[PDB]
Design a protein around this nucleic acid. Structure first.
Ligand SMILES: Nc1ncnc2c1ncn2[C@@H]1O[C@H](COP(=O)(O)OP(=O)(O)OP(=O)(O)O)C[C@H]1O
Ligand SMILES: [Zn+2]
Ligand SMILES: [Zn+2]
Ligand SMILES: [Zn+2]
Lengths: 34, 46, 50, 65, 1105, 50
RNA sequence: GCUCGCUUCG
């Protein structure tokens, strides 16, 4: 779940070679870096 | 769902399902290309 | 345009719009549009003989 | 691979004069007189037609067909 | 009265190319290996038996390699084409089988066809399927007819075995040491052992040094040990010159100081200096003198053979060596290593022969071990080798040695690397030039600068200009256009003819005759063949007999008058070059012979047999007189050069008028042509490689060299002819840059295609589970696949014809995590790319291991822009500085606007007059519809193209009246217009552009990665830090090297000085003195590593005030 | 065998005999095209053995 | 992802 909005729309979307699991609703970066 | 492929020498439309040994009828060649898609593609003349 | 072989097929639609040659050379209507100064050869002294 | 439609420098239509040029090669015409008869005055179109290599048939020989 | 000249003489070059030339070397070597050498290797190890249980043996009868086949089918073979091996990522090999006879239970059992391995088949070889095929049959097999071949295909990759260069074996080398002492060295190498024995003069006397001796011993003691005990005979063998005796005096005095006067005493002294090879197994039983005699007979000077413990030949050899050292101790006539007459070239044949011999010996040893372990204790069930003949040994050995490229031969103690290299498919010229490469034994790691020089011995053999610019300058070379590498001969008739020609036996006379001024020593592959008088008659008779055909044409004979030695070389690897024989100021080749050759009456072999053209070696041509042209022929001429432009190699042949340019320009042009973009072959569409560059509209050059016609480069061009105007425009072409025309690029000029490969594998694991591809994950909201899975078809594999964007999946691969229900995790093949790509084809194949291999061929169509690198076939590499419109380009009276504007300032510093000559010739040719020739040391002259220009109404110097396109006013100076063959290089700005955000870091050291494919950041090297220090920018250096790279916050305890964690010190079991501290992560790693090394750094912290 | 992008580039260089004064410039975007500011050319060629 | 080798680039 997202720590800010509590949503479950956590998508793994890499932004320019940066692995990043981020919430799809508010854009809160859950996890980043591999 | 009928999945179609093309042989490397006979060039015939062969329908094979999942987990099948890659082969072609009336021959023994083992190179199987995929047919071109039917979706519309837009190109720029630039 | 191209050369084909039996089995091959070319199917397409072409959308053409108005455009100027500055954007792309394909809109250039003239193949070669140029100008040159008119020459005027003059003889300082009368040349004769071989 | 194939003869370009437009000349690189000027832009005269040259793709339509390729096969006929080949006909002039099938005839007794040389290179220079054939290029002159085709209407190529400037040397850019002459270089375009003369230095072009016809690789489309060599590739079609390897085409699936 | 000028000497008549044969105009058609150059026609001798293509005929030579019909049977020999560029690629025939490796092909012939591989054929000789697989047809003759392999049988000899099998015969050398035909019988293998074990010591236990005698009367048991395994006898090989005959070995075959057969035709290439694939083991895909279940226990059935099938013919496979090399292109199929390229596609399926398998090897192109043929089953090595052998027929044998053995004894199972003392009853003879024979097998007529039993496979034992798989030999990778070289392309276009004798057993290759591609040989003897027509271009139509090549098209049926999806192989280019113009492909040079000669390379191996292993696991889908193309490996080429480079020609190795090494020093000749069994040759005396007189050289100076580190301290200036002029000593000698001889590396006696036989089929079994290679031993380098040296001789020094460190203290005015000669000591002999070998790896089998504890201390170097005087040479006189060795002389006394080898049979000759009288000192007078030793002195006579060394020489009778006064200075020779004066130099050898100290050695005799040192020998007389000791009590060594007989052979037994000398052998005992030598044995005292012998050390056991670490407790050799077996009872010695007083082997000291015996070990000394065995080392003298077998180990020392292996190449010099002793009939039955008769060291007469070895004594004469070491006496000649001492004499050479004495003579070299005066006038500094030190032999040089870079002289290519002492060089030998090993092709793929000899390397493969050694590798196969080693593998077969290992297989025989393994079989003998298995026999010894199985036969004496198993059961009454008689053991047979057939149940234990593993067939994967030789196959895996060959595959690994060819693929990895590192060769480790313990039987020969040879540890080589970089033997095989990936064939470069940048262009046809790239592969054609890489096929004829030669690497040096120096194996560059340091600045030698002694072999890197261009020696005059490379004349006609190796290309002088073609060399990789960089660290490998001078140590990687290319063969010439007309060259040949010799093979090994039988050496029998050579010895017979030498003995019949009056060569006196060396055993019949003493060494004093060696000191006579008219007596010349005759050698043979490093062995003393004997002595002779009037060596001119001997050399003339040997050359005439070689010309007649009774002696092999590759046997070389040379004479050294300084050392008075007649060398007869018959070993393989020597470089030879054909030359026309000249007798009495008139060449043997006439116009009638060339007419017969042109009509087809005779071939090059007929010229060889009729004593018209003969092969000359470097050592042989050292004594011969060669004339470049007919007018240069004088009274003292023995040979005539066939064609001078054959001096250049393959890559150098593309240079139009290379003799008008500078040598660094030619080197840079060769380097860039090795990277030139263009077509690869007629099968370039079905070919699927990891990276391919193709040209949209390639055009053959207008100024083509005869080498281009010979190598058929005009069929596969790698560039385009553009109307270049040499002038300065807008100041965007300051240093090497060029201005491109926008309208030209818009109409297809310079348009290029980049093909990349994306391969995925679905393999079956040990457990009965397999990798499976899921369908496109359709979105329930819109009933359509998601943006990531948009391009996927119904089977989860991307379909050709669509465009792929960044971070899109091509194959929806999911793999199990077990190796009870299987658990699959997704590992899809995402497309990493800045620009979009189009899928041309998707190939799906199945290997024998049920692993599905899927290869997608992505295509990108790129247009020349700012940053693309362009070449002009003259080393004038440039970058597109500005793209101006067509109307901004200047125009002539005819209305022609230039495509490429190049800076004139690059001409004076580089002196590239050849570029101007090529431009003029190309302009004349496109005017009169002809193809002018830029042949080296020849070609079309300037007067002819000037007349062609003046005839067509243009200026005779290329400069034309041009009006400025911008201002509309004529220019004050005429502009140099003309068609130039410009070639685009693979170096693009799109691939080289890089930008690095925070991104990922490395696990060991938390710093950005290295490569762009790894998305790494730039590195501030030591010199950048030095510059930042010199500027005095402390804060910028701190931000770059600490804040932005490896910043971290550690916890240090102020009591013990150690590193804590989470504000706690485990050492002191307290947390009151623990304080946070900023630090580079590499510094913390260093501190931890030092603590691991018992070097404990104790940090005493303090307030910043 | 001819690439799709190369085919489109070759088709773009082909001149059209249409009078440009009777058409107008296509607005920004509007890829669908209208009757006033576009033209459509269909090219469908299927090669087969004689 | 670590290592090594080749290769290019200035
Ligand atoms: N090994 C290297 N170390 C440092 N810089 C290098 C190295 N190799 C190339 N460069 C860079 O390339 C430049 C070398 O060019 P330079 O030697 O001056 O001209 P050039 O290569 O001789 O060209 P010409 O042959 O004169 O046309 C200078 C340097 O910044
Ligand atoms: Zn088929
Ligand atoms: Zn033109
Ligand atoms: Zn502490």
């Amino acid at each position: 779940r997202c720590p800010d909005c509590g949503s479950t729309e956590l998508v793994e979307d890499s932004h320019y070679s940066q692995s990043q699991l981020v919430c799809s609703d508010c854009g809160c970066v859950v996890t980043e870096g591999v | 769902q009928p999945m179609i492929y093309i042989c490397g020498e006979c060039h015939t439309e062969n329908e094979i399902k999942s987990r099948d040994p890659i082969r072609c009828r009336e021959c023994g060649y083992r190179i199987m290309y995929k047919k071109r898609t039917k979706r519309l593609v837009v190109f720029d003349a630039r | 345009i191209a050369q084909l072989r039996p089995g091959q097929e070319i199917d397409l639609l072409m959308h053409c719009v108005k455009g100027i040659g500055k954007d792309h050379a394909k809109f250039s209507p003239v193949a070669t549009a140029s100008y040159r100064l008119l020459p005027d050869i003059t003889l300082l002294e009368p040349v004769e003989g071989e | 691979m194939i003869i370009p439609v437009r000349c690189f420098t000027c832009g005269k239509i040259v793709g339509n004069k390729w096969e006929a040029y080949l006909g002039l090669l099938q005839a007794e015409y040389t290179e220079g007189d054939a290029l002159d008869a085709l209407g190529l005055k400037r040397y850019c179109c002459r270089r375009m037609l003369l230095a072009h290599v016809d690789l489309i048939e060599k590739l079609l020989n390897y085409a699936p067909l | 009265a000028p000497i008549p000249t044969v105009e058609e003489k150059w026609r001798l070059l293509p005929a030579f190319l019909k049977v020999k030339g560029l690629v025939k070397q490796h092909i012939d070597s591989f054929n000789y290996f697989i047809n003759v050498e392999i049988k000899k290797i099998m015969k050398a190890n035909e019988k293998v038996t074990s010591d236990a249980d005698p009367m048991w043996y395994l006898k090989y009868l005959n070995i075959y390699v057969g035709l290439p086949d694939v083991e895909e089918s279940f226990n059935v073979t099938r013919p496979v084409s090399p292109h199929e091996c390229r596609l399926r990522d398998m090897t192109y090999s043929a089953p090595i089988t052998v027929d044998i006879e053995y004894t199972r239970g003392s009853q003879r059992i024979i097998r007529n066809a039993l496979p034992i391995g798989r030999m990778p088949i070289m392309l276009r070889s004798s057993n290759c399927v591609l040989t003897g095929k027509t271009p139509a049959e090549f098209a049926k097999l999806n192989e280019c007819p113009l492909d040079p071949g000669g390379y191996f295909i292993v696991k889908g990759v193309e490996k080429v075995i480079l020609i190795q260069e090494q020093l000749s074996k069994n040759r005396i080398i007189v050289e100076a040491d580190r301290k200036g002492a002029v000593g000698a060295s001889v590396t006696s190498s036989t089929h079994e052992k290679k031993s380098r024995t040296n001789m020094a003069v460190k203290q005015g006397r000669f000591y002999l040094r070998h790896n089998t001796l504890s201390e170097d011993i005087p040479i006189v003691i060795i002389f006394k040990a080898m049979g000759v005990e009288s000192d007078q005979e030793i002195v006579q063998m060394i020489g009778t010159e006064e200075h020779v005796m004066a130099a050898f005096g100290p050695s005799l005095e040192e020998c007389q100081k000791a009590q060594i006067f007989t052979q037994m005493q000398a052998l005992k002294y030598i044995g005292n200096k012998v050390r056991r090879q670490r407790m050799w197994g077996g009872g010695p039983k007083k082997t000291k003198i015996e070990e000394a005699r065995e080392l003298l007979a077998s180990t020392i000077l292996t190449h010099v053979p002793v009939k039955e413990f008769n060291f007469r030949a070895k004594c004469i050899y070491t006496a000649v060596m001492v004499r050479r050292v004495i003579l070299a101790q005066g006038d500094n006539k030190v032999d040089d290593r870079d002289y290519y007459g002492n060089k030998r070239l090993e092709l793929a044949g000899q390397l493969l022969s050694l590798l196969f011999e080693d593998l077969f010996k290992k297989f025989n040893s393994e079989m003998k071990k298995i026999a010894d372990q199985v036969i004496p204790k198993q059961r009454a069930a008689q053991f047979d080798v057939v149940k234990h003949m593993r067939q994967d040994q030789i196959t895996n050995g060959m595959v690994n040695a060819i693929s990895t490229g590192n060769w480790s031969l313990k039987r020969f103690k040879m540890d080589r690397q970089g033997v095989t290299q990936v064939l470069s498919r940048l262009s046809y010229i790239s592969a054609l030039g890489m096929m004829t490469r030669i690497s040096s034994q120096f194996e560059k790691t340091r600045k030698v600068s002694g072999p890197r020089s261009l020696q005059p011995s490379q004349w006609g053999m190796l290309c002088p200009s073609d060399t990789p610019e960089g660290e490998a300058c001078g140590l990687v070379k290319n063969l010439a256009l007309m060259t040949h590498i010799t093979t090994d001969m039988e050496d029998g008739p050579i010895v017979k003819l030498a003995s019949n020609l009056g060569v006196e036996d060396v055993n019949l006379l003493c060494g004093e005759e060696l000191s006579y001024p008219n007596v010349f020593l005759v050698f043979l592959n490093g062995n003393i063949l004997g002595v002779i008088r009037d060596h001119k008659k001997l050399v003339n008779t040997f050359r005439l007999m070689r010309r007649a055909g009774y002696i092999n044409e590759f046997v070389s004979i040379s004479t050294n008058l300084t050392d008075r030695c007649v060398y007869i070389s018959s070993d393989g690897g020597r470089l030879c070059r054909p030359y026309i024989i000249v007798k009495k100021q008139k060449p043997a080749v006439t116009n009638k012979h060339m007419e017969e050759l042109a009509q087809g009456y005779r071939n090059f072999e007929d010229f060889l047999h009729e004593s018209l053209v003969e092969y000359l070696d470097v050592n042989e041509e050292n004594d011969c007189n060669i004339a470049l042209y007919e007018h240069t022929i004088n009274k003292d001429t023995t040979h005539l050069e066939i064609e001078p432009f054959t001096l250049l190699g393959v890559c150098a042949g593309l240079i139009p008028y290379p003799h008008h340019n500078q040598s660094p320009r030619n080197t840079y042009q060769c380097a860039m042509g090795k990277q030139a973009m263009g077509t690869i072959g007629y099968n370039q569409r079905n070919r699927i490689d990891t990276l391919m560059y193709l040209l949209a509209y390639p055009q053959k050059p207008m100024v083509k060299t005869k080498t281009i016609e010979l190598i058929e480069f005009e069929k596969l061009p790698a560039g385009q002819n553009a109307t270049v105007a040499v002038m300065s425009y807008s100041g965007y072409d300051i240093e090497d840059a060029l201005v491109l025309n926008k309208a030209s690029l818009d109409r297809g000029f310079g348009r290029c295609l980049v093909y990349k490969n994306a391969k995925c594998t679905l393999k079956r694991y040990t457990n009965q589970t397999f990798d499976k591809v899921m369908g496109p994950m359709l979105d329930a909201a819109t009933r359509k696949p998601i943006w990531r899975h948009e391009i996927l078809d119904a089977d989860g594999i991307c379909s050709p014809g669509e465009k792929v964007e960044n971070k899109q999946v091509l194959v929806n691969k999911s793999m199990p995590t077990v190796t009870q229900q299987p658990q699959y995790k997704d590992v899809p093949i995402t497309y990493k790319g800045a620009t979009d790509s189009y899928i041309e084809k998707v190939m799906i194949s199945s290997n024998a291991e049920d692993a599905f291999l899927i290869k997608m061929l992505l295509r990108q169509t790129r247009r020349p822009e700012i940053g693309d690198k362009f070449s002009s076939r003259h080393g004038q590499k440039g970058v597109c500085g500005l793209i101006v419109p067509q109307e901004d380009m200047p125009f002539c009276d005819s209305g022609i606007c230039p495509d490429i504007i190049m800076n004139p300032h690059g001409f004076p510093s580089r002196m590239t007059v050849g570029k101007l000559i090529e431009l003029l010739a190309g302009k004349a040719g496109v005017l009169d519809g002809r193809f002018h020739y830029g042949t080296a040391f020849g070609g079309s002259k300037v007067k002819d193209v000037c007349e062609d220009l003046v005839r067509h109404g243009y200026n005779y110097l290329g400069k034309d009246y041009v009006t400025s396109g911008i201002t509309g006013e004529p220019l004050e100076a005429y502009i140099y217009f003309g068609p130039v063959y410009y070639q685009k290089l693979k170096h693009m700005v799109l691939d080289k552009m890089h930008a690095r955000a925070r991104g990922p870091r490395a696990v060991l050291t938390r710093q950005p990665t290295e490569g762009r494919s790894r998305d790494g950041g730039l590195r501030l090297g030591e010199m950048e830090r030095d510059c930042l220090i010199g500027y005095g920018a402390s804060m910028l250096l701190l931000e770059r090297l600490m804040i932005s790279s490896d910043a971290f916050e550690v916890d240090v305890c102020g009591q013990c000085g150690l590193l804590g964690y989470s504000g706690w010190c485990h050492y002191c079991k307290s947390s009151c003195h623990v304080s946070s501290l900023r630090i580079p992560y590499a510094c913390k790693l260093l501190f931890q590593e030092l603590q691991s090394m018992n070097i404990i750094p104790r940090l005493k912290l303090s307030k910043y005030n | 065998i001819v690439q799709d992008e190369i085919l489109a580039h070759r088709l773009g260089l082909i001149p059209i005999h249409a009078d440009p004064r009777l058409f107008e410039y296509r607005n920004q975007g509007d890829e669908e095209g209208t009757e006033i500011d576009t033209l459509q050319f269909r090219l469908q060629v299927r090669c087969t053995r004689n």
